[PDB]
């Protein structure tokens, strides 16, 4: 920060402290910049990562929920009445050359059921029954076809295209970016005249805590947060409902910085190599990184809960007591007839 008192470009925060010798060194996700290296000794890059944007995960579309039922809001009972129609016209074909049963038999040949009756004695009625069977088969083929219509091929494409998105290049009110205070990406965007396409918006929505930038995305206020991948992918893979773009925005690494002329670096960086040689870095990963507590990006979408099919079974349960009342009515009809 250029202090306005006597034009003093002083490194803010702890970097000014180690500049003044309040500490000898620092371990941190140390972003490497040109202005830092003019004053600070740096070691070899201990970590390799990149710049990424974290956003909220999209809501899943459909499962067993308020569910896509059979498609027949229309043509359901009307084609049911045509079952009665084809039953009675075939009855008329048997009337002038087996009435109520013919209704239920026509229901069975709709439902591919073996109920009672056979072919009529007029072969034209059997021909109409065969074309009705082709009709029921194209009915169930279209049923399988409309299941195939809505379970695959579609999802709302609501992703970013990368760093060249004009929703960030020409930002509107519907897009909020954090780019948290005293971070290296702020100097990076100050260096880019092409990012003067609003940098001031990014200054108007600058934050202080990164966890607040997490929460504001969870509160759907912040639209996007720019950060290193080594934090973003790990916290996204451990705490769900947050996904990254995947696109690496800037190539970067994390070394360790000391003050000038401390001669330990020659053994320090080699020790970073030495911890690289036994895979002690991979021991750090096995003790911290590999515990990924979320699912993958693959939504496979082919998953199924089977809890909401019992709404059909309730219709079976209503049909049970309806059959009980019909048994009582048929008992009364046997009392009459």
């Amino acid at each position: 920060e250029r202090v306005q008192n006597s034009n003093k470009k002083e490194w803010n925060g702890m970097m000014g402290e180690l500049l003044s010798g309040q500490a000898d060194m620092i371990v941190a996700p140390l972003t490497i910049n040109n202005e830092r290296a003019q004053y600070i000794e740096f070691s070899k890059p201990f970590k390799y990562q990149g710049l990424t944007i974290l956003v909220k995960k999209e809501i899943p579309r459909s499962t067993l929920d308020s569910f896509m039922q059979p498609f027949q809001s229309t043509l359901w009972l009307l084609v049911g009445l045509s079952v009665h129609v084809v039953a009675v016209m075939l009855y008329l074909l048997d009337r002038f050359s087996t009435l109520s049963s013919a209704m239920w038999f026509s229901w069975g040949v709709l439902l591919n059921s073996g109920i009672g009756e056979g072919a009529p004695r007029s072969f034209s009625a059997r021909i109409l029954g065969m074309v009705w069977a082709g009709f029921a088969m194209i009915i169930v083929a279209s049923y399988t076809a409309n299941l195939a219509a809505f379970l695959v091929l579609d999802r709302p494409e609501e992703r970013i295209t990368g760093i060249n998105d004009p929703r960030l290049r020409n930002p509107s009110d519907k897009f909020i970016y954090a780019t948290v205070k005293q971070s290296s990406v702020d100097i990076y965007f100050r260096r880019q005249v092409e990012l003067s396409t609003m940098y001031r918006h990014m200054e108007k929505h600058n934050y202080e805590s990164a966890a607040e930038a997490i929460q504001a995305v969870r509160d759907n206020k912040l639209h996007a947060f720019i950060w290193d991948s080594a934090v973003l992918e790990f916290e996204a893979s451990q705490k769900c409902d947050l996904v990254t773009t995947g696109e690496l925005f800037f190539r970067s690494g994390f070394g360790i910085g000391m003050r000038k002329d401390s001669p330990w670096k020659q053994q320090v960086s080699l020790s970073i190599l030495k911890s690289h040689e036994n895979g002690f870095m991979e021991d750090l990963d096995k003790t911290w990184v590999r515990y990924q507590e979320c699912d993958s990006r693959s939504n496979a979408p082919a998953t199924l809960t089977c809890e909401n099919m019992a709404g059909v079974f309730m219709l079976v349960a209503g049909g049970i007591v309806a059959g009980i009342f019909l048994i009582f009515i048929e008992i009364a009809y046997k009392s009459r007839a």
Binding site: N33, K44, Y48, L151, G279, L315, L326
Partner: protein, 316 residues
């Protein structure tokens, strides 16, 4: 300036620079894949609803008891099984059935459920994220190569620092590559194309580059390209040079502008990067029904158990 791996064996002799490119070592293999998902493909169809079918097996049978008050209960259970199923066998014909109306209440659940089931099997056939690589080099493919019955024999550059690192780390896999080592990486690529080499270990930067440059990119690296050894590409510097600090500052300037993306776009493109996809699988011989056959033979044991238990019930 060549392409030098930054290592301890050169830092003791020469001075390094700040690495401009993060690189690393992995294994290139040519893979042939398919859609191999075993008999638990029905894990979307959770069995907690399947027993929800089975109590609907019983309760309407109780209503059949009153239809029997107007041939038995234990005979109609496989009728109801075939009513769940696509039945073909001759069945009972109930006389005073209002349960024939209860078949319309059943409203064929084969027609609903089986069609939705094979629809979701079509969904899983659309979306099966199949892999065949062996990540995790502590797997026996690099530990016990003779435990399988191909003799695994790998190759690398003989005058290479990577095999010196390998002889410095594991204990003996360099001697395991002592059977054959390839000088000339295109010869290794053609040897892996002809199935001679089993696996080729090299620096994953040029491996990724040549894999994207290949036409039919079945020749891919292990996993998502995650290396196991990782380093950078530095510059050999005469020791105690005052300029090299200014050089490294200039490297941070070249990182400050973002031209190195354009310099990669000189060569990064044309890649079939593009790899989480599914290829067709003709006649694919999966033998998951052998697991179903294990359920079958287990049921054959159960039948034998019922036969002997009935025989002792003939003794009682």
């Amino acid at each position: 300036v060549g392409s030098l791996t930054i290592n301890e064996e050169r830092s003791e002799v020469v001075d390094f620079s700040v690495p401009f490119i993060e690189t690393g070592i992995s294994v290139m293999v040519s893979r042939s894949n398919g859609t191999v998902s075993p008999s638990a493909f029905l894990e979307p169809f959770s069995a907690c609803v399947w027993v929800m079918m089975f109590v609907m097996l019983l309760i309407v049978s109780a209503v059949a008891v009153f239809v029997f008050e107007y041939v038995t209960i234990g005979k109609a259970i496989w009728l109801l099984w075939g009513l769940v199923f696509n039945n073909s066998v001759p069945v009972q014909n109930p006389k005073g059935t209002t349960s024939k109306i209860m078949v319309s209440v059943w409203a064929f659940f084969a027609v609903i459920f089986l069609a939705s089931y094979t629809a979701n099997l079509a969904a899983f056939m659309i979306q099966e994220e199949y892999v065949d690589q062996v990540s995790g080099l502590s797997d026996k493919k690099f530990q016990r190569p003779n435990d399988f019955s191909p003799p695994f024999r790998f190759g690398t550059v003989p005058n290479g620092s990577t095999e010196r690192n390998i002889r410095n780390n594991y204990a003996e896999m360099h001697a395991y590559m002592g059977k054959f080592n390839q000088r000339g990486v295109d010869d290794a690529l053609l040897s892996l194309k002809t199935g001679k080499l089993d696996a080729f270990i090299y620096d994953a930067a040029v491996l990724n580059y040549m894999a994207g440059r290949d036409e039919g990119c079945k020749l891919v690296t292990i996993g998502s390209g995650k290396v196991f050894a990782s380093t950078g590409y530095g510059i050999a510097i005469q020791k105690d040079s005052g300029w090299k600090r200014q050089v490294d500052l200039a490297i941070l300037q070249l990182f400050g502008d973002g031209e190195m993306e354009e310099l990669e776009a000189l060569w990064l493109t044309g890649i079939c990067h593009n790899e989480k996809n599914e290829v067709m699988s003709s006649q694919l011989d999966i033998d998951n029904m052998a697991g179903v056959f294990y359920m079958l033979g287990a049921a054959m044991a159960l039948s034998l158990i019922t036969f002997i238990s009935e025989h002792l019930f003939y003794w009682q």
